[PDB]
Amino acid sequence: GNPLVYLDVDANGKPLGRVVLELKADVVPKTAENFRALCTGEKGFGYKGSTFHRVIPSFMCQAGDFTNHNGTGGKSIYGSRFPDENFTLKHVGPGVLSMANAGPNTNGSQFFICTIKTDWLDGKHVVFGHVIEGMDVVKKIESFGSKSGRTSKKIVITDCGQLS
Ligand SMILES: CSCC[C@H](NC(=O)NCc1ccc(N)cc1)C(=O)N1CCC[C@@H]1c1ccccc1SC
């Protein structure tokens, strides 16, 4: 079946717990595979040690810029960017996992987890999974954001990987 992956997240060096994500490889296999491999680190790079750099309460928590740590960088397992696979899955509510981008066909490694239904992103950001476990951890991360997106604590993916 679809992969299950995890992110273990700290805030100011204290563990918050684990977010477990189902990757919908049945719908978006290329996008799911990228995220899966960036969690395991098996290509020699990935999410371990990187941050949630933009967090906006009542919107989303964004992470995955493991090269510049500020929303300008990241890279995929395929190359620096890859196309929008499809827009079949929608931003239906809290817990949706979706790709950040800089316009059409600019997926890399940055991603976000929604904390509300974000329907205006449908057709613009590729949804590729959802939170299975750890929404409490996501709500803690969210609480450390601000309207500008600047975080009030240093939020780090200390470990990540594949469960199945
Ligand atoms: C269209 S305005 C830019 C959209 C923004 N983009 C980035 O943060 N882009 C930088 C970026 C993302 C991925 C790659 N590979 C390279 C650069 C982005 O992907 N997202 C995902 C949810 C949070 C943010 C966003 C989207 C729509 C409206 C507002 C916002 S943040 C105020």
What CATH class does 1-164 carry? mainly beta
Catalytic site residue 112? Answer: yes
| CA dist., res. 121 & res. 91, Å (int) | 7
Pocket of ligand 1, beta carbon within 6 A = 60, 62, 71-72, 74, 100-102, 106, 108, 110, 112, 125, 149
Catalytic site residue 101? Answer: yes
The alpha carbon of 104 and the centre of ligand 1 are apart by a number of angstroms equal to: 11
**Residue 5 near residue 35, CB atoms below 8 Å:** yes
Q: Determination technique for this PDB entry?
A: X-ray
Distance set, CA 18 to CA 37, 74, 87, 117, 146 (Å): 18, 22, 28, 22, 22
Catalytic site residue 18? Answer: no
Rg (CA), the chain: 14
Q: Which two three-digit tokens encode residue 42?
A: 């098996």
* 113 residue type, one letter: I
| CA dist., res. 122 & res. 88, Å (int) | 9
**Residue 31 near residue 126, CB atoms below 8 Å:** yes
What are the sequence ranges of the domains in the chain? 1-164
Please give the distance of CA 39 from its chain centroid, rounded to a whole number.
10
The alpha carbon of 159 and the centre of ligand 1 are apart by a number of angstroms equal to: 24
**Residue 61 near residue 52, CB atoms below 8 Å:** yes
Distance spanning both ends of the chain, measured CA to CA: 8
